Design a protein around this ligand. Structure first.
Ligand SMILES: COc1c(/C=C/C(=O)c2ccc(O)cc2)ccc(O)c1O
Ligand SMILES: COc1c(/C=C\C(=O)c2ccc(O)cc2)ccc(O)c1O
Ligand SMILES: [Zn+2]
Ligand SMILES: [Zn+2]
Lengths: 176, 176
Protein backbone atom coordinates (compact mmCIF):
# COMPACT_ATOMS: atom_id res chain seq x y z
CA UNK A 1 0.00 0.00 0.00
CA UNK A 2 2.13 2.85 -1.26
CA UNK A 3 5.27 4.56 0.09
CA UNK A 4 5.40 6.41 3.37
CA UNK A 5 6.26 10.13 3.25
CA UNK A 6 9.75 9.33 4.54
CA UNK A 7 10.29 6.54 1.98
CA UNK A 8 9.10 8.74 -0.86
CA UNK A 9 11.43 11.51 0.19
CA UNK A 10 14.31 9.05 0.38
CA UNK A 11 13.79 8.54 -3.36
CA UNK A 12 14.22 12.27 -4.11
CA UNK A 13 17.65 13.63 -4.99
CA UNK A 14 18.60 17.29 -4.82
CA UNK A 15 18.69 19.08 -8.12
CA UNK A 16 21.93 19.02 -10.04
CA UNK A 17 23.05 22.65 -10.72
CA UNK A 18 22.98 21.93 -14.49
CA UNK A 19 19.14 21.78 -14.22
CA UNK A 20 18.77 24.94 -12.12
CA UNK A 21 17.13 26.91 -15.00
CA UNK A 22 14.81 24.09 -16.18
CA UNK A 23 11.14 24.92 -16.37
CA UNK A 24 8.00 22.87 -17.07
CA UNK A 25 6.90 24.70 -20.18
CA UNK A 26 4.18 22.67 -21.98
CA UNK A 27 1.68 19.83 -21.98
CA UNK A 28 0.70 18.66 -25.45
CA UNK A 29 -2.76 17.35 -26.36
CA UNK A 30 -3.96 16.39 -29.86
CA UNK A 31 -7.23 18.14 -30.78
CA UNK A 32 -9.84 17.03 -33.40
CA UNK A 33 -11.17 20.50 -34.14
CA UNK A 34 -9.01 23.51 -33.26
CA UNK A 35 -11.95 25.93 -33.71
CA UNK A 36 -13.86 24.27 -30.93
CA UNK A 37 -10.76 23.88 -28.76
CA UNK A 38 -9.71 27.55 -29.13
CA UNK A 39 -13.23 28.68 -28.26
CA UNK A 40 -13.30 26.48 -25.12
CA UNK A 41 -9.83 27.34 -23.75
CA UNK A 42 -10.22 31.10 -24.31
CA UNK A 43 -13.96 31.88 -23.81
CA UNK A 44 -14.71 29.14 -21.23
CA UNK A 45 -11.37 28.96 -19.33
CA UNK A 46 -9.89 32.49 -20.00
CA UNK A 47 -6.55 31.36 -21.50
CA UNK A 48 -4.81 33.37 -24.23
CA UNK A 49 -3.51 32.11 -27.61
CA UNK A 50 0.16 33.18 -27.50
CA UNK A 51 1.48 31.34 -30.60
CA UNK A 52 0.44 29.37 -33.63
CA UNK A 53 2.79 27.29 -35.83
CA UNK A 54 1.83 25.57 -39.10
CA UNK A 55 3.81 22.82 -40.82
CA UNK A 56 2.41 22.18 -44.31
CA UNK A 57 4.64 19.13 -45.02
CA UNK A 58 3.67 17.33 -41.87
CA UNK A 59 0.08 18.67 -42.20
CA UNK A 60 -0.34 19.87 -38.62
CA UNK A 61 -0.60 23.11 -36.62
CA UNK A 62 0.47 23.90 -33.07
CA UNK A 63 -1.52 26.32 -30.83
CA UNK A 64 0.06 27.48 -27.54
CA UNK A 65 -2.40 28.66 -24.86
CA UNK A 66 -1.38 30.24 -21.54
CA UNK A 67 -2.62 32.36 -18.69
CA UNK A 68 -0.77 35.39 -20.04
CA UNK A 69 -1.74 39.01 -20.71
CA UNK A 70 -2.18 39.23 -24.53
CA UNK A 71 -0.70 42.76 -24.22
CA UNK A 72 2.61 41.10 -23.28
CA UNK A 73 2.92 39.10 -26.51
CA UNK A 74 5.88 40.38 -28.64
CA UNK A 75 4.92 41.72 -32.04
CA UNK A 76 7.96 40.44 -34.02
CA UNK A 77 7.82 36.81 -35.10
CA UNK A 78 11.17 35.52 -33.82
CA UNK A 79 10.83 37.37 -30.53
CA UNK A 80 7.26 36.05 -30.22
CA UNK A 81 8.34 32.39 -30.57
CA UNK A 82 11.15 32.77 -28.06
CA UNK A 83 8.77 34.43 -25.56
CA UNK A 84 5.91 31.92 -25.92
CA UNK A 85 8.18 28.88 -25.72
CA UNK A 86 9.80 30.24 -22.51
CA UNK A 87 6.51 30.75 -20.68
CA UNK A 88 5.73 28.29 -17.86
CA UNK A 89 2.48 26.22 -17.86
CA UNK A 90 1.49 26.36 -21.54
CA UNK A 91 -0.97 24.11 -23.21
CA UNK A 92 0.13 22.89 -26.62
CA UNK A 93 -2.76 21.83 -28.86
CA UNK A 94 -1.71 19.83 -31.99
CA UNK A 95 -4.16 19.81 -34.95
CA UNK A 96 -3.55 17.03 -37.45
CA UNK A 97 -5.10 18.47 -40.60
CA UNK A 98 -8.35 16.81 -41.66
CA UNK A 99 -9.49 15.31 -38.34
CA UNK A 100 -12.36 17.79 -37.93
CA UNK A 101 -13.90 16.42 -41.18
CA UNK A 102 -13.61 12.70 -40.28
CA UNK A 103 -16.65 11.36 -38.42
CA UNK A 104 -14.81 8.08 -37.63
CA UNK A 105 -11.95 9.81 -35.77
CA UNK A 106 -11.61 10.81 -32.11
CA UNK A 107 -8.71 11.07 -29.67
CA UNK A 108 -8.39 9.04 -26.44
CA UNK A 109 -8.51 10.86 -23.05
CA UNK A 110 -6.26 8.48 -21.03
CA UNK A 111 -8.98 7.69 -18.44
CA UNK A 112 -9.99 4.32 -19.87
CA UNK A 113 -8.01 1.38 -21.26
CA UNK A 114 -5.31 2.03 -22.22
CA UNK A 115 -4.77 4.49 -19.34
CA UNK A 116 -1.92 6.92 -18.85
CA UNK A 117 -2.44 10.71 -18.88
CA UNK A 118 -5.34 11.67 -16.61
CA UNK A 119 -6.04 15.42 -16.71
CA UNK A 120 -4.88 19.01 -16.66
CA UNK A 121 -5.93 20.99 -13.65
CA UNK A 122 -6.93 24.66 -13.24
CA UNK A 123 -6.61 26.34 -9.85
CA UNK A 124 -9.55 28.80 -9.32
CA UNK A 125 -10.48 31.13 -6.38
CA UNK A 126 -13.87 29.41 -5.97
CA UNK A 127 -14.86 26.03 -7.43
CA UNK A 128 -18.57 26.48 -6.94
CA UNK A 129 -18.79 29.92 -8.55
CA UNK A 130 -16.57 28.77 -11.44
CA UNK A 131 -18.75 25.70 -11.93
CA UNK A 132 -22.01 27.63 -11.87
CA UNK A 133 -20.70 29.69 -14.78
CA UNK A 134 -19.48 26.56 -16.64
CA UNK A 135 -23.04 25.25 -16.18
CA UNK A 136 -24.63 28.43 -17.60
CA UNK A 137 -22.18 27.97 -20.54
CA UNK A 138 -23.21 24.35 -21.26
CA UNK A 139 -19.90 22.71 -20.23
CA UNK A 140 -19.81 18.96 -20.01
CA UNK A 141 -19.01 17.71 -16.52
CA UNK A 142 -17.32 14.46 -15.47
CA UNK A 143 -17.83 15.25 -11.80
CA UNK A 144 -19.72 18.12 -10.27
CA UNK A 145 -18.41 19.83 -7.12
CA UNK A 146 -20.92 18.12 -4.76
CA UNK A 147 -20.99 14.82 -6.74
CA UNK A 148 -19.12 11.93 -5.06
CA UNK A 149 -17.01 11.74 -1.89
CA UNK A 150 -14.57 14.52 -2.95
CA UNK A 151 -16.86 17.53 -2.40
CA UNK A 152 -15.44 20.92 -3.46
CA UNK A 153 -13.41 19.46 -6.38
CA UNK A 154 -14.73 19.25 -9.98
CA UNK A 155 -13.88 17.74 -13.37
CA UNK A 156 -15.10 19.13 -16.69
CA UNK A 157 -14.34 18.02 -20.23
CA UNK A 158 -13.01 19.93 -23.23
CA UNK A 159 -14.40 19.46 -26.82
CA UNK A 160 -12.22 16.36 -27.30
CA UNK A 161 -13.32 14.96 -23.94
CA UNK A 162 -10.02 15.56 -22.15
CA UNK A 163 -10.59 15.91 -18.45
CA UNK A 164 -9.86 19.15 -16.62
CA UNK A 165 -9.72 19.31 -12.87
CA UNK A 166 -11.19 22.43 -11.17
CA UNK A 167 -9.55 22.87 -7.77
CA UNK A 168 -9.46 25.53 -5.11
CA UNK A 169 -6.04 25.39 -3.40
CA UNK A 170 -7.26 27.30 -0.34
CA UNK A 171 -10.04 24.85 0.52
CA UNK A 172 -8.12 21.65 -0.16
CA UNK A 173 -6.76 21.13 3.42
CA UNK A 174 -9.77 18.92 4.36
CA UNK A 175 -9.10 16.08 1.87
CA UNK A 176 -5.82 14.02 2.21
CA UNK B 1 -5.32 22.66 -44.97
CA UNK B 2 -5.54 23.77 -41.30
CA UNK B 3 -6.60 27.23 -40.06
CA UNK B 4 -5.33 30.61 -41.19
CA UNK B 5 -3.93 32.90 -38.60
CA UNK B 6 -6.97 35.22 -38.93
CA UNK B 7 -9.44 32.27 -38.63
CA UNK B 8 -7.68 30.96 -35.53
CA UNK B 9 -7.76 34.38 -33.80
CA UNK B 10 -11.38 34.73 -34.84
CA UNK B 11 -12.17 31.71 -32.60
CA UNK B 12 -10.46 33.36 -29.60
CA UNK B 13 -12.44 35.26 -26.93
CA UNK B 14 -10.93 37.75 -24.44
CA UNK B 15 -10.68 36.47 -20.93
CA UNK B 16 -13.92 36.87 -18.87
CA UNK B 17 -13.13 38.58 -15.53
CA UNK B 18 -14.49 35.49 -13.77
CA UNK B 19 -11.22 33.73 -14.89
CA UNK B 20 -8.83 36.56 -14.13
CA UNK B 21 -6.96 34.64 -11.38
CA UNK B 22 -7.13 31.08 -12.88
CA UNK B 23 -3.81 29.31 -13.43
CA UNK B 24 -2.72 26.07 -15.06
CA UNK B 25 -1.70 24.24 -11.96
CA UNK B 26 -1.09 20.61 -12.93
CA UNK B 27 -0.63 17.85 -15.53
CA UNK B 28 -1.48 14.41 -14.14
CA UNK B 29 0.23 11.26 -15.32
CA UNK B 30 -0.32 7.77 -13.82
CA UNK B 31 2.90 5.96 -12.71
CA UNK B 32 3.53 2.26 -12.33
CA UNK B 33 6.29 2.66 -9.71
CA UNK B 34 6.72 5.92 -7.77
CA UNK B 35 10.20 4.94 -6.65
CA UNK B 36 11.58 5.06 -10.17
CA UNK B 37 9.46 8.10 -11.11
CA UNK B 38 10.59 10.17 -8.12
CA UNK B 39 14.22 9.27 -8.75
CA UNK B 40 13.92 10.26 -12.40
CA UNK B 41 12.02 13.51 -12.04
CA UNK B 42 14.23 14.69 -9.09
CA UNK B 43 17.71 13.24 -9.77
CA UNK B 44 17.57 13.36 -13.62
CA UNK B 45 15.30 16.35 -14.28
CA UNK B 46 15.94 18.48 -11.15
CA UNK B 47 12.34 18.84 -10.00
CA UNK B 48 11.32 19.02 -6.34
CA UNK B 49 8.70 16.88 -4.58
CA UNK B 50 6.48 19.57 -2.98
CA UNK B 51 3.48 17.56 -1.70
CA UNK B 52 2.36 13.92 -1.24
CA UNK B 53 -1.23 12.82 -0.51
CA UNK B 54 -2.41 9.30 0.40
CA UNK B 55 -5.92 7.92 0.08
CA UNK B 56 -5.90 4.56 1.86
CA UNK B 57 -9.52 3.54 1.13
CA UNK B 58 -9.14 4.24 -2.61
CA UNK B 59 -5.61 2.72 -2.58
CA UNK B 60 -3.72 5.48 -4.37
CA UNK B 61 -1.18 8.26 -3.77
CA UNK B 62 -0.52 11.63 -5.46
CA UNK B 63 2.95 13.09 -5.86
CA UNK B 64 3.31 16.78 -6.82
CA UNK B 65 6.53 17.70 -8.46
CA UNK B 66 7.62 21.21 -9.51
CA UNK B 67 10.59 23.48 -10.34
CA UNK B 68 10.47 25.26 -6.95
CA UNK B 69 13.18 25.86 -4.35
CA UNK B 70 12.71 23.36 -1.54
CA UNK B 71 13.37 26.27 0.89
CA UNK B 72 10.06 27.92 -0.27
CA UNK B 73 8.00 24.88 0.81
CA UNK B 74 5.95 25.96 3.87
CA UNK B 75 6.88 24.12 7.05
CA UNK B 76 3.25 23.65 8.15
CA UNK B 77 1.16 20.88 6.57
CA UNK B 78 -1.98 22.88 5.66
CA UNK B 79 -0.20 25.95 4.43
CA UNK B 80 1.99 23.61 2.39
CA UNK B 81 -1.05 22.08 0.60
CA UNK B 82 -2.37 25.55 -0.22
CA UNK B 83 1.11 26.72 -1.47
CA UNK B 84 1.79 23.53 -3.42
CA UNK B 85 -1.66 23.44 -5.08
CA UNK B 86 -1.32 27.16 -6.09
CA UNK B 87 1.99 26.67 -7.84
CA UNK B 88 1.90 26.91 -11.66
CA UNK B 89 3.28 24.12 -13.82
CA UNK B 90 3.21 21.13 -11.37
CA UNK B 91 3.48 17.56 -12.52
CA UNK B 92 0.99 15.37 -10.62
CA UNK B 93 1.90 11.69 -10.46
CA UNK B 94 -0.77 9.21 -9.45
CA UNK B 95 0.28 5.75 -8.12
CA UNK B 96 -2.52 3.20 -7.86
CA UNK B 97 -1.11 0.84 -5.17
CA UNK B 98 -0.09 -2.57 -6.54
CA UNK B 99 0.81 -1.71 -10.16
CA UNK B 100 4.49 -1.89 -9.36
CA UNK B 101 4.14 -5.67 -8.52
CA UNK B 102 2.02 -6.49 -11.64
CA UNK B 103 3.98 -7.78 -14.61
CA UNK B 104 0.78 -7.63 -16.73
CA UNK B 105 0.12 -3.88 -16.19
CA UNK B 106 1.70 -0.87 -17.99
CA UNK B 107 0.57 2.67 -18.77
CA UNK B 108 0.24 4.01 -22.32
CA UNK B 109 2.11 7.15 -23.43
CA UNK B 110 -0.53 8.38 -25.93
CA UNK B 111 1.81 8.31 -29.00
CA UNK B 112 0.57 5.02 -30.43
CA UNK B 113 -3.03 4.21 -31.27
CA UNK B 114 -5.13 5.24 -29.53
CA UNK B 115 -3.45 8.63 -29.46
CA UNK B 116 -4.37 11.72 -27.42
CA UNK B 117 -1.91 13.18 -24.91
CA UNK B 118 1.51 13.60 -26.52
CA UNK B 119 4.09 14.86 -24.01
CA UNK B 120 5.22 17.35 -21.47
CA UNK B 121 8.15 19.58 -22.34
CA UNK B 122 10.97 21.20 -20.34
CA UNK B 123 12.62 24.36 -21.61
CA UNK B 124 16.37 24.26 -21.00
CA UNK B 125 19.32 26.61 -21.74
CA UNK B 126 21.21 23.98 -23.67
CA UNK B 127 19.59 20.96 -25.35
CA UNK B 128 22.86 19.25 -26.27
CA UNK B 129 24.54 19.57 -22.84
CA UNK B 130 21.33 18.41 -21.11
CA UNK B 131 21.07 15.39 -23.35
CA UNK B 132 24.79 14.55 -23.01
CA UNK B 133 24.12 14.32 -19.27
CA UNK B 134 20.88 12.35 -19.80
CA UNK B 135 22.94 9.83 -21.89
CA UNK B 136 25.56 9.53 -19.14
CA UNK B 137 22.74 8.74 -16.67
CA UNK B 138 21.22 5.93 -18.84
CA UNK B 139 18.10 7.85 -19.91
CA UNK B 140 16.05 6.36 -22.76
CA UNK B 141 15.57 8.61 -25.81
CA UNK B 142 12.75 8.77 -28.36
CA UNK B 143 14.78 11.35 -30.27
CA UNK B 144 18.38 12.56 -29.74
CA UNK B 145 18.81 16.30 -30.62
CA UNK B 146 20.54 15.58 -33.87
CA UNK B 147 18.24 12.74 -34.99
CA UNK B 148 15.62 13.17 -37.67
CA UNK B 149 14.49 16.48 -39.22
CA UNK B 150 14.00 18.81 -36.22
CA UNK B 151 17.64 19.34 -35.21
CA UNK B 152 18.34 20.79 -31.75
CA UNK B 153 15.13 19.34 -30.26
CA UNK B 154 14.99 16.19 -28.14
CA UNK B 155 12.50 13.81 -26.67
CA UNK B 156 13.36 11.59 -23.75
CA UNK B 157 11.29 8.90 -21.93
CA UNK B 158 10.43 8.66 -18.27
CA UNK B 159 10.23 5.29 -16.36
CA UNK B 160 6.65 4.67 -17.67
CA UNK B 161 7.64 5.69 -21.21
CA UNK B 162 5.92 9.11 -21.21
CA UNK B 163 7.60 11.43 -23.72
CA UNK B 164 9.32 14.57 -22.51
CA UNK B 165 10.39 17.18 -25.00
CA UNK B 166 13.64 19.01 -24.28
CA UNK B 167 13.75 22.37 -26.07
CA UNK B 168 15.66 25.63 -26.03
CA UNK B 169 13.13 28.46 -26.64
CA UNK B 170 15.83 30.72 -28.02
CA UNK B 171 16.94 28.31 -30.74
CA UNK B 172 13.37 27.46 -31.84
CA UNK B 173 13.20 30.48 -34.17
CA UNK B 174 16.79 30.06 -35.43
CA UNK B 175 16.66 26.28 -35.96
CA UNK B 176 14.43 27.11 -38.96
C1 LIG C 1 4.64 18.79 -30.32
O1 LIG C 1 5.75 19.61 -29.89
C2 LIG C 1 6.51 20.35 -30.77
C3 LIG C 1 6.75 20.02 -32.16
C4 LIG C 1 6.34 18.79 -32.86
C5 LIG C 1 5.16 18.27 -33.25
C6 LIG C 1 5.02 17.03 -34.07
O2 LIG C 1 6.02 16.57 -34.70
C7 LIG C 1 3.75 16.18 -34.10
C8 LIG C 1 2.97 15.95 -35.24
C9 LIG C 1 1.85 15.12 -35.22
C10 LIG C 1 1.47 14.46 -34.05
O3 LIG C 1 0.37 13.62 -33.94
C11 LIG C 1 2.25 14.66 -32.91
C12 LIG C 1 3.37 15.49 -32.94
C13 LIG C 1 7.58 20.91 -32.86
C14 LIG C 1 8.08 22.06 -32.29
C15 LIG C 1 7.80 22.39 -30.96
O4 LIG C 1 8.25 23.49 -30.30
C16 LIG C 1 7.06 21.53 -30.16
O5 LIG C 1 6.84 21.91 -28.84
C1 LIG D 1 -7.42 14.63 -9.69
O1 LIG D 1 -6.09 14.59 -9.17
C2 LIG D 1 -6.35 14.95 -7.87
C3 LIG D 1 -7.10 14.08 -7.04
C4 LIG D 1 -7.76 12.86 -7.52
C5 LIG D 1 -7.80 12.02 -8.57
C6 LIG D 1 -6.79 11.61 -9.59
O2 LIG D 1 -5.59 12.02 -9.66
C7 LIG D 1 -7.21 10.52 -10.54
C8 LIG D 1 -6.68 9.23 -10.36
C9 LIG D 1 -7.02 8.18 -11.19
C10 LIG D 1 -7.90 8.39 -12.26
O3 LIG D 1 -8.24 7.32 -13.07
C11 LIG D 1 -8.46 9.66 -12.45
C12 LIG D 1 -8.11 10.71 -11.61
C13 LIG D 1 -7.38 14.54 -5.75
C14 LIG D 1 -6.90 15.72 -5.24
C15 LIG D 1 -6.11 16.53 -6.06
O4 LIG D 1 -5.55 17.72 -5.69
C16 LIG D 1 -5.84 16.16 -7.37
O5 LIG D 1 -5.05 16.96 -8.15
ZN1 LIG E 1 5.73 20.11 -27.80
ZN1 LIG F 1 -5.28 16.22 -10.20
Amino acid sequence: GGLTDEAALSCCSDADPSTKDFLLQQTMLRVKDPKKSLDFYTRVLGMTLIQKCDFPIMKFSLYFLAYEDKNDIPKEKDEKIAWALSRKATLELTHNWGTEDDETQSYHNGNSDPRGFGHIGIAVPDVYSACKRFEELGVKFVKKPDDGKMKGLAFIQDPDGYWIEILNPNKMATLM
